[PDB]
């Protein structure tokens, strides 16, 4: 069964991939090489072209992603050659540096060796390569509550956070054959952070908010042609609302709206004053302003939705079915001001794609 | 088949209704009366208690409605006795007056005679009893574009709008046996309108915006126990975002955001300035303020979501499955600031319920 699943996924993928690459005539011979390879080895190895286009197709198929217009420009780094934890660490450091690109963020994916017998070669524990720690104890909450479980797991490995609201979690991953993950502190020179200030409201710096420049999702599985790349961290740039309407605003995250309300000089007393909405807008304006001011890539949700509309038009023009998850595609502020809100999307799962996998902690 | 559908829906409804009313023991005898009635007449007649609780259950089952906490307080007006167009007209006028209640809006439904052989006794053409006309011609757009088709249909019946942006459409409905609907101008004394002003920004009145006090949906079919009440207009009060984030803001409706931006003194030039979001918040604050100032019922989306959370808790506590359509339940501004956004809802259709039906024009 295992092998039959693999073979069927490989056939569909290679046929589709090669068609898109204009290599339609090579499908037959490649499929033959793959089938015998699967027969012999229980698996097969992607060519660099297949892997690269596979990661791009996976992004293009990511229903929840508004940023897919740029799918074909994904920078794919093939690190299927890594074998040691230092090679993994340096590959992760490299991804951060090359994706960050001095602020002009390059959408990048680094692809590590894939699972073999469902057995991981590299198991990344981080949810994002760059993320803040979270702590909860003695009534006290510090940092990002979303990171509490990983933070506690890290501190079981002998790491200790300074317990600021913005401690960078170390990289943490486990190699095949090791019982415990290893952790490495992020070099701060690698990590761009953006202080959050507001273009018009000077008191906004009193909140001492900041966020990191590059969201590098590191806990999803890239599946391409039946091959499971469980370790394949990827990044785009932020859409401002992710930071301003969610990371800094959610009650279960940094929960900053009341403080925002206070510094922008509005009462946070009456639902009918829409103070939360006003705070959200000002916080989101601040986030966009701050990233732009620092020369770090970011997109506002209106521009992002306009780009997504072009992705829709490109899909229709290429004869590709468009898939989408409306609930994730609409931005969390002024969604009805985007075209996304006013149409529907087929939430079908098409592969290649990125998938959730169980946390190792 | 027709009759079998009816009988099965009746059994389920009566059993459920009577259970909720503590009349469990009367189900058997009532079901017998109904079956013989269906046998004899091809249909059956709801008792006033069944009809009332039916309309309430239908509201309680309305997946898209955030206002359902108050389902059990629906004021049900039974107008199954009407036979003439003047009785229908006066019943509609009465609904407007009694629902409006001098601004302290009473959620009300007026139930007209149900379809018989699928044949309507009363066919209401209005989408809402109170709504503004829309016109498009010679490049020029006036009023509410959403009403363009009905407006044109009305003007085919000898009605003529003044072509302000806020012409009240007349009531328009067709009686069984008549080829053409009749129309009646709404008495202006019946119709509460609210001028839109802003609590802090005096220039906001320069927009000369207004909206009507009571949304009275008049084109949906109430289905209860297999009986199709195609004419059963109902109303709640507005949630502010419906007016401020949709009716006045949508590009395909009144499209007021650029004008709002101008009067609140912000540039409408750059997506990154989030001027649309800021305009939306200020427009929505104005709408809530204006309704409150005029003593007309309205709810803000935060309060509405808190009420909905209580509806969820009430459902769980009553042992009723909760159904919901997340895409309609989230408000179109700051949805992530509500609990609704952060959970999922079973969008199953449970009857009794309100359903779309084909437009007669
Ligand atoms: C180029 C800039 C990018 C932007 C602005 C962007 C935007 C977004 C946003 C805003 C979301 C979350 C939507 C929400 O919270 O409701 C998202 C989800 C996602 N994006 Fe993108 N994205 C970008 C690049 C990428 C890249 C390069 C990949 C992969 C190669 C990717 C794959 C995904 C996936 C898989 C999700 C869903 C994650 C999940 O289910 O938790 N995106 N994107
Ligand atoms: C009491 C005040 C009420 C409030 C604040 C309220 C709120 C809302 C809102 C905001 C929506 C639309 C959601 C959206 O646009 O995304 C809605 C939809 C709906 N409401 Fe309510 N509602 C109320 C009363 C009622 C009543 C009395 C009924 C019927 C007896 C009702 C039945 C519905 C139905 C059927 C829909 C869906 C309409 C459609 O599919 O087009 N609501 N409600
Ligand atoms: C590569 C990349 C770039 C970018 N700019 N953004 C992302 C998405 C990051 C992300 C990751 C996760 C973890 N599953 C969640 C979210 C938002 C999650 C979320 C949470 C709740 C809701 C409700 C409706 N939509 C919702 N979406 C966002 C990924
Ligand atoms: C009784 C009642 C009271 C009240 N306050 N609001 C309503 C709902 C009125 C309404 C009617 C219709 C017509 N189908 C539509 C809408 C909003 C429609 C809408 C349109 C687009 C989207 C996208 C996501 N959700 C969306 N919802 C709202 C009904
Ligand atoms: Cl994030
Ligand atoms: Cl409306």
Swiss-Prot record, chains A, B:
Gene Ontology MF term list: heme binding; metal ion binding; nitric-oxide synthase activity
Pfam families linked to this entry: NO_synthase
Cofactor(s) the protein needs: heme; (6R)-L-erythro-5,6,7,8-tetrahydrobiopterin
Source superkingdom: Bacteria
UniProt catalytic activity: 3 reduced [flavodoxin] + 2 L-arginine + 4 O2 = 3 oxidized [flavodoxin] + 2 L-citrulline + 2 nitric oxide + 4 H2O + 5 H(+)
Keyword field contains Cell inner membrane: no
Keywords on record: Heme, Iron, Metal-binding, Oxidoreductase
Residues where heme binds: 65
GO biological process: nitric oxide biosynthetic process
EC number(s) recorded for this UniProt protein: 1.14.14.47
Free-text remark on how the cofactor is bound: Tetrahydrobiopterin (H4B). Can also use tetrahydrofolate (THF) in place of tetrahydrobiopterin (H4B) but binds THF with much lower affinity than H4B.
Keyword Oxidoreductase attributed: yes
Note: This protein is similar to the oxygenase domain of eukaryotic nitric oxide synthases but lacks the reductase domain which, in eukaryotes, is responsible for transfer of electrons to the ferric heme during nitric oxide synthesis.
Subunit structure: Homodimer.
PANTHER family: NITRIC OXIDE SYNTHASE, NITRIC OXIDE SYNTHASE OXYGENASE
Function: Catalyzes the production of nitric oxide.
Protein's recorded name: Nitric oxide synthase oxygenase
Gene name of this polypeptide: nos
